[PDB]
Ligand binder design. Structure first.
Ligand SMILES: CC(=O)N[C@@H]1[C@@H](O)[C@H](O)[C@@H](CO)O[C@H]1O
Ligand SMILES: CC(=O)N[C@@H]1[C@@H](O)[C@H](O)[C@@H](CO)O[C@H]1O
Lengths: 423, 423
C-alpha cells in the first residue's frame, strides 16, 4: 500500500478561505480530489487565526478545521493537519504576540512553547473525534524560522530544537493518527542549521521530506536531466540514512513541478519520472503532490510559478499533470515495495549521528554528485552513515555489498535555500 | 453641541471578536453605551483580516464592520471607523505581505499605498450605505510605525508623509462623513519625527489628538496635580496652535485614566477634572473616552493597566468612572463654548510652521512647563506660533493681548514614548 494525496489549496480563496469559508466550494474541491483516485489530503490552517492572543484560542477557527476534515472524510479521504503556519509559499503568518513590540522566540521562550502545546492539544483532542483525521504535523517547514537567511530569525541551538520537538510532539500523539513535523531541505544541506537529519529521522513517526528541484537541482544538472528527475529518490535515500531504525518510513510529503525551472510542457513527464524513481526507495510510505489547486491569479506577490503548481487549474479543471498523477496512483498504489539495495554511498557523521559536512549533500556537492553518478550508472545506490559502514554485522544485516566513500569532498555548487531570486 | 462617546472595545473577545463575533453581546455592548448617554462610538477592524493579500480584500470582514456600524445606528449612536490596525494597545496586526520575506514600507511603497487606497475606497463605499457612518480615520496612531523606537520601523521623511496622507485622505472623503487620521503624541514631542504638528492641524477634517498621562505627565507633575488634570487641555491647545485655520476643530479622540500612574479610586476624579478643563478649549469638538469595556482578563501580554481602562467591567457592569463620564455628557453636551483667551505662549517655528524644538513641548520641557505655570496660576493660556506672534494683524484677529516666549529652552525631563517599561 503506497499512499497518494495532495496538499490541499482551496480553489476559492486559497488559505485566505479560512476568513470566510465557502463550504460548498471546499466540498466540491475535495470531491474532485477524491475522484482523481487520491486517498488523502494535507490541510493548512492559519496560526494567528487559531491563536491571536497567547492565552485565547479561536474556537470557531478550530471547528472550521474540524469541518474541513469531516468533509474530506465524507469523500473517502484521509486528512493530515499542519498547525503552525507559520510559513506558506513565501508568506509568514505570525501571531502579533510574537512580533515587533512583542517579539519573541517560538522555540526557546517558555511562554510561547506553553501556548504552542495548548493549541496542539486542543487541535488534537477535537480532531481525534473525526475518523478521517490520520495525523498531525507540527507545522510546515517550521525550521525556516530558525536560521539564516530568515530576516527575523528566531535563533536556537540543535539541543534547544531537540527540547522543542520533545515538548510538542507528545501533545500531538494519540490513538489513531501520526505525530509529525516538517522541514525544508536546509536540514540536510546547511552546516550549523539547528534542525538536523538525526532529528528528522528519529523524532515523530515518519521521516518527512519536501522535494523541490528549484533549489539548484534543476538549474545545475538540467531541468530535463535524469539527475533532476532522480532527486526525490535521492532526498528519500538521504533522509532515511540518519535513523537508527533502517525501516523507518519516509513521507514524500511535498513534491511539485515548479515552472520557474521546468518548462510547462515538461511537467507531466517530470511528474511521471520523478514519482517512478521515488518508488524505488522501499522505505517510501506516500507521495503527496504540491498542490491540488492553482493559486488564484487575483492574488499578487507570489513568485509567479506558485500560481500554476496545481493539479487543477484556476477554473477547477483537471490539468495534464493531474491526469498523470492520478494515473500514477492507480498504477502504483498496490505495487510491491522496491527491492533492497546492495550498493551504498557512505557519509561520515559525528558521535551524535549527524553529517560532518552537510554542504556536501546538497545540489552539486561531492556526495550528491557521487550518488547521482551511481544512480545514472544503474547501480541503484543507497546511502548509509559512517557508523554503519564501520560495523560489519550492521552491514550484513542490511545486505550491503559495495561501499563508496566521498574521498575528495567539496561543498554544493548548485544549492540555493530560497524559492525565488527576489528573496 | 459637545460630542461624548467611547472607543468601543468588545466586552467578549476584545478585537479578536472579529474572528468569531458574538453579535448578541455586541448588541448588548452598544446598548449599554447608548443608555449611558454617549452619542458616538469609535470602532477598530483589523487590517490583516480585511486585506490578507495585497490585491485581495475579505468581503465578509468588510461586511462585519458594516454590521457593527449598523448595530450602533440601531441605538442612536454615530459610528467612526479606523482602518489600518495596525497598532492596538501595544500589539501590531500587520499583513503578511508587508513582513519578513515581504518586508515593505507602508508609507513609501507605491504598491502598498495603492492597496491602502483600494481598502479605504472599499470601506468608505460600503460603510457609506449606513446613515450611522459619520467618519473614517485612516488608522490608530499610524505614526508609531514610522520612526524610533519601533523595532521594525518603516521610516520616511515628513515630505513622504505629506505625500502619503495626501494620497489616502481624498479616498476617505464623501458626503455625510469626515475624513481623518490619528497619531500618538510623538508627533509633537519627538524631534525629527516625520509625522508633524503642521500635518495634524492641516490634513483631514479635524485635528486629532490622543491624551495619555502615562507619557511622563503623571509621574513628573503628580498624578493628582493641577498639571496632570490640565494635560488634555494642554494637548488640545498645543495641537491647534500649528494650524492655518484658527477655528479648525480639535477632536480629543482618546483620553483614558491609566492605572499604572493613577490610583484606582482616583480615576473618576481624574475624569471629571480632565474633561472640565478640556472643554475650556473653544475648538474642542468632542471627547471620546478610552475605553468602553474592560479587556478580558483571560488575554495576556497586555500591559496590566490596559485591562481596567473600561467604563464597564468585564461582566458588563457600569464602573464609577463610567457613571461619572455619563453625567459629564449630560452636564456638557449642550454647553456654550469656552470664552476666548487673551494670554498666549509663543512657540518658535520653522518656515513651514513646525516647531524648531519639539522636545521642549513634552512633559517637563520648557514650553510645557511654561504653559502649565500660567494655567495653574489661573491665566488660561492659549498657544501660538512665532509666525502669528510676529504679525500684529494675525494677533488682533485672534484677540491676543499678552505673549510669553521660551527664553531658556530645555528638553522634556519627564517624557517617555512608551506605555510600559517593558518596551
Ligand atoms: C521565502 C522562501 O523562499 N520560502 C520557500 C518556501 O516557499 C518553500 O516552501 C520552500 C521549499 O521547501 O523553500 C523556501 O525557501
Ligand atoms: C509600544 C507602546 O507602548 N505603544 C503605546 C501605544 O500602545 C499607546 O496606544 C500610545 C498612547 O498614546 O502610546 C504608545 O507609546
Amino acid at each position: 500500500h503506497m499512499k497518494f494525496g495532495v496538499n490541499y489549496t482551496p480553489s476559492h480563496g486559497w488559505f485566505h478561505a479560512w476568513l470566510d469559508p465557502d463550504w460548498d466550494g471546499i466540498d466540491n474541491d475535495l470531491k474532485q480530489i477524491s475522484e482523481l483516485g487520491m486517498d488523502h489530503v494535507r490541510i493548512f490552517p492559519i496560526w494567528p487565526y487559531l491563536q491571536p492572543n497567547r492565552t485565547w484560542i479561536n474556537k470557531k477557527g478550530v471547528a472550521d478545521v474540524r469541518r474541513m476534515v469531516h468533509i474530506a472524510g465524507e469523500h473517502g479521504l484521509d486528512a493530515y493537519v499542519d498547525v503552525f503556519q507559520g510559513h506558506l509559499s513565501s508568506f509568514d503568518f505570525l501571531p502579533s504576540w510574537l512580533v515587533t513590540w512583542h517579539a519573541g522566540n517560538m522555540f526557546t521562550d517558555a511562554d510561547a512553547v506553553a501556548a504552542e502545546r495548548e493549541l496542539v492539544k486542543t487541535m488534537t483532542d477535537e480532531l481525534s473525534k473525526e475518523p478521517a483525521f490520520k495525523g498531525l504535523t507540527l507545522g510546515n517547514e517550521v525550521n525556516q524560522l530558525s536560521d539564516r537567511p530568515h530576516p527575523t530569525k528566531m535563533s536556537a541551538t540543535d539541543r534547544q530544537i531537540d527540547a522543542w520537538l520533545d515538548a510538542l510532539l507528545p501533545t500531538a500523539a494519540g490513538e489513531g493518527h501520526n505525530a509529525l513535523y516538517s522541514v525544508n531541505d536546509g536540514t540536510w544541506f546547511i552546516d550549523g542549521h539547528p534542525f538536523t537529519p538525526v532529528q528528522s529521522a528519529t523524532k515523530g513517526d515518519m521521516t518527512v521530506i519536501h522535494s523541490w528541484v528549484f533549489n539548484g537541482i534543476a538549474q545545475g544538472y538540467g531541468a530535463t536531466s535524469e539527475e533532476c528527475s532522480s532527486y526525490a529518490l535521492y532526498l528519500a535515500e538521504l533522509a532515511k540514512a540518519f535513523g537508527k531504525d533502517s525501516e523507518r518510513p519516509v513521507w514524500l510529503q511535498e513534491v511539485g513541478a515548479p515552472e520557474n525551472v521546468l518548462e510547462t510542457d515538461y511537467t507531466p513527464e517530470f511528474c511521471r519520472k520523478t514519482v517512478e524513481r521515488a518508488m524505488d526507495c522501499r522505505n517510501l510510505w506516500g507521495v503527496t503532490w504540491w498542490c491540488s489547486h492553482d493559486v488564484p491569479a487575483s492574488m499578487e506577490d507570489f513568485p509567479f510559478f506558485e500560481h500554476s503548481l496545481g493539479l487543477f487549474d484556476e477554473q477547477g479543471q483537471l490539468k495534464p499533470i493531474g491526469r498523470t498523477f492520478g494515473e500514477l496512483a492507480a498504477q502504483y498504489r498496490s505495487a510491491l515495495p522496491a527491492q533492497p539495495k546492495t550498493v551504498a554511498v557512505v557519509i561520515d557523521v559525528d558521535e551524535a549521528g549527524n553529517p560532518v559536512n552537510r554542504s556536501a549533500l546538497g545540489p552539486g556537492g561531492s556526495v550528491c554528485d557521487l550518488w547521482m553518478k551511481l544512480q545514472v550508472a544503474g547501480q541503484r545506490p543507497t546511502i548509509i552513515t559512517s557508523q554503519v559502514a564501520a560495523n560489519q554485522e550492521a552491514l550484513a544485516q542490511r545486505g550491503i555489498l559495495e561501499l563508496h566513500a566521498d574521498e575528495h569532498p567539496y561543498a554544493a555548487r548548485y544549492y540555493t535555500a530560497v524559492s525565488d531570486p527576489s528573496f
